[PDB]
């Protein structure tokens, strides 16, 4: 079992909050990301493996959208060609800079298309006769611990959504029963299928923001390395397979501060449990490498259950936290960083 990698990325500022002209709390002495209140009763200091400083375009070591790819995401691609599975997560609440980093906008790209483009580049470089690759994409979510596919039946069909169910092949692993995945050939089809999905992610308008996601979106790609017929006969190790998972999680959203009942409270309760189990899984998996007999609780959550074959074994994991530099979110921001520490140790 390999090590989990954890990083942090601070957004510059939002023009919406800038009407208030609130203050700055986060500071960076290289890799010790210090936090300070306006009162300065205490001063917190968090140390992580990696740290991205995107507060303003003055400081050296500014981490442009390019800098995340070569630093965190490109090794996932380099290992996927070796047959090993990979996973990337993303943890931050509404307004953190999360979907800016996953995909960005058409002019400032994120992590998904810049990854899937270099993927096809290294394919077309090695699309020889001895080797021939095949890609397949799927995109689903988790709402109240129910799996839904974002690319099926488009709603308005009597019923609302299709609650698929998870099962366990004995040797292949966990899987979803009823997920017509897709086939791809190049990059634009991925963008079309993904724009078709995110419109149907079951978001909801909480008081803090009009668009706040209440689902853990999962994007899975499957890569195969088929080889050719050897001279003696028709048998050749052509089943080298790999699986790339990219998750866009939701925010913790504590409910005492945000007076929410009825259905948002159930959503929140489903979101805080998945996050807790995910943290427990990552901590156990990072404690197994250091030498210990520990049980990894996959089965206590669906997102940790379907991805059992992507975290354990000899696979690689990665996590990106996103925090606001303001003081208004100081109780929110700190929580994220605290979770990241639990992933590091």
């Amino acid at each position: 079992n390999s090590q989990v990698t954890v990083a942090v990325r601070v957004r510059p500022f939002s023009k919406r909050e800038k009407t208030e002209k609130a203050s700055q709390v986060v500071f960076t002495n290289g890799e010790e990301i210090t936090v300070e209140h306006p009162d300065m009763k205490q001063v917190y200091s968090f140390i992580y493996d990696v740290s991205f400083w995107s507060f303003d375009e003055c400081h050296p070591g500014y981490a442009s959208q390019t800098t995340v790819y070569e630093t965190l995401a490109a090794p996932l691609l380099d290992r996927a060609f070796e047959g090993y599975n990979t996973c990337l997560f993303a943890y931050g609440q509404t307004g953190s800079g999360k979907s800016y980093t996953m995909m960005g906008l058409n002019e400032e790209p994120g992590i998904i298309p810049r990854f899937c483009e270099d993927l096809f580049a290294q394919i077309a470089k090695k699309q020889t006769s001895e080797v021939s690759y095949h890609l397949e994409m799927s995109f689903f979510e988790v709402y109240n611990e129910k799996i839904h596919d974002l690319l099926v039946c488009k709603g308005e069909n009597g019923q609302r959504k299709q609650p698929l169910r998870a099962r366990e092949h004995p040797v292949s692993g966990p899987y979803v029963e009823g997920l017509s995945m897709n086939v791809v050939s190049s990059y634009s089809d991925i963008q079309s299928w993904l724009e078709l999905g995110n419109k149907q992610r079951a978001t909801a308008a909480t008081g803090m923001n009009d668009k706040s996601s209440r689902s853990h979106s999962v994007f899975t790609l499957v890569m195969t390395q088929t080889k050719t017929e050897v001279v003696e006969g028709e048998e050749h190790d052509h089943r080298i397979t790999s699986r790339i998972n990219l998750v866009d999680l939701a925010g913790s959203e504590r409910c005492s501060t945000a007076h929410s009942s009825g259905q948002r409270l159930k959503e929140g309760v489903s979101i805080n449990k998945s996050l807790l189990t995910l943290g427990k899984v990552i901590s156990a998996l990072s404690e197994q490498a250091n030498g210990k007999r520990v049980f990894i609780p996959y089965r206590e959550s669906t997102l940790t259950w379907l991805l059992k074959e992507s975290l354990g074994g000899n696979s690689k994991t990665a996590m990106i936290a996103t925090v606001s530099p303001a003081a208004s979110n100081i109780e929110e921001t700190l929580s994220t960083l605290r979770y990241a520490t639990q992933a590091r140790l």
């Binding site: 913790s252 409270l265 805080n272 994220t336 605290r338």
Partner: protein
């Protein structure tokens, strides 16, 4: 007039009130139904004392208190017991379901839609009072109600009533003894709020009073209605200067000043030295010096913390009965001459003193004895950090594995909130180290 509103949250607060009022009604001359026979016979005096009991024109007397537990199994013993014709029927049961020993239930999901009645009855009782100066609260740090409803209530009352003393006579969990395996959690999350909102939070521990009940009262098999009858005596020694006369009187806006150096260290202790039995009541003098010295003994403390591992920042001494001042000003000098008892360099004055003329009352069916004098100490010590750390360690032992946490997030809670509360509990065990340091120049 002077008044004090007494709130009683949870089973602990209810079982304490059922003794506190049993004592007050007897101190003032009130039957369990409400009617006093003394006012018609003697024809004078304010024995219907307005600090706790309001009066109706029909000769009836109505207490200034409220009850709420989110479980009707307790208060229904009042609505069907001996004290039913006294209390207002608005004893806010809302117990369609209990709070499962988790703060997340007493805070949001069974603590909302119930609190409005509480904050309405408190307004109704405050409108009846002219010179209100106190919101006493009785709860327990351990349970979901005492931890959650109390924090949902104090944060509301600090908005509503604001510049008004609040006092929490709470039950701190014991190190070894316990009746639950979540008290290390429900206690830390409470401090994170009451530390900011409350003004002076006393603390008692059932282990200490158990020990007191065997080494002094000769009871080998005690129950809770023996300890609650000592807690009632504490609250009566506190609230006596409000009701009865005395040479040196002490109001509730004086503990808040002479025992609270900084706003975050308002967690004192409490004692009551003569708890002697009717057999040992004879064979003994029970003078001011003996009692005052007994208040400074570790064995007689109603909280489990060796005060010799720390220093005293302040201390009050509320006497009750036949006492003379120079007996007191001779008793304290013997304490300052002693080298086991320490005092911070920033408080040589140290002592607040209070005297009252009304002696205690002996509740029948009881273990306490008749005494011509009785005392209650209220000390602020730097030793109770060692009692706080014992909880914090437990937290760190059952949060590294994230145990029992899903029962909290399952009822409206975030993981990081637990971490934030632990950070708040660590800042306070550091300030106690700051105050304990001798200055240098």
């Amino acid at each position: 007039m002077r008044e004090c509103i007494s709130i009683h949250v949870g089973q602990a607060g209810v079982q304490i009130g059922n003794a506190c009022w049993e004592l007050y009604c007897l101190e003032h001359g009130i039957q369990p139904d409400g009617q006093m026979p003394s006012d018609k016979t003697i024809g004078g005096g304010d024995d219907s004392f307005n600090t706790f009991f309001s009066e109706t024109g029909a000769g009836k007397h109505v207490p200034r208190a409220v009850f709420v537990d989110l479980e009707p199994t307790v208060i229904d013993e009042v609505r069907t017991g001996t004290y039913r014709q006294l209390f207002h029927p608005e004893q806010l049961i809302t117990g369609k379901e209990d709070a499962a020993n988790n703060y997340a239930r007493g805070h949001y999901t069974i603590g909302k839609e119930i609190i409005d009645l509480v904050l309405d009855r408190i307004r109704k009782l405050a409108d009846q009072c002219t010179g209100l100066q106190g919101f006493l609260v009785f709860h327990s740090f351990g349970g979901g109600t005492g931890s959650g409803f109390t924090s949902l209530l104090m944060e509301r009352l600090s908005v509503d009533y604001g510049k008004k003393s609040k006092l929490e006579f709470s039950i701190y969990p014991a190190p070894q003894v316990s009746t639950a395996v979540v008290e290390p959690y429900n206690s830390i999350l409470t401090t994170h709020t009451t530390l900011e909102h409350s003004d002076c939070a006393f603390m008692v521990d059932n282990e200490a009073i158990y020990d007191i009940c065997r080494r002094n009262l000769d009871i080998e098999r005690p129950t809770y209605t023996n300890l609650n009858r000592l807690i009632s005596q504490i609250v009566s020694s506190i609230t006596a200067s409000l009701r009865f006369d005395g040479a040196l009187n002490v109001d509730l806006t004086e503990f808040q000043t002479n025992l609270v150096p900084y706003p975050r260290i308002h967690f004192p202790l409490a004692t009551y030295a003569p708890v002697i039995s009717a057999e040992k009541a004879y064979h003994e003098q029970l003078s001011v010096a003996e009692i005052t010295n007994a208040c400074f003994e570790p064995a007689n403390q109603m909280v489990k913390c060796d005060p010799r591992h720390g220093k005293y920042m302040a201390c009050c001494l509320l006497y009750r009965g036949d006492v003379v001042p120079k007996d007191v000003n001779a008793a304290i000098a013997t304490i300052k001459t002693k080298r086991s008892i320490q005092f911070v360099d920033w408080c040589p004055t140290g002592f607040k003193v209070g005297i009252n003329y009304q002696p205690p009352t002996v509740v029948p069916g009881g273990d306490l004895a008749k005494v011509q004098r009785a005392v209650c100490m209220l000390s602020n010590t730097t030793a109770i950090a060692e009692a706080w750390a014992r909880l914090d360690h437990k937290f760190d032992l059952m949060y590294a594995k994230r145990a029992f946490v899903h029962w909290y997030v399952g009822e409206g809670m975030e993981e990081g909130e637990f971490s934030e509360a632990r950070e708040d509990m660590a800042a306070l065990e550091k300030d106690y180290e700051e105050v304990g340091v001798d200055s240098v120049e």
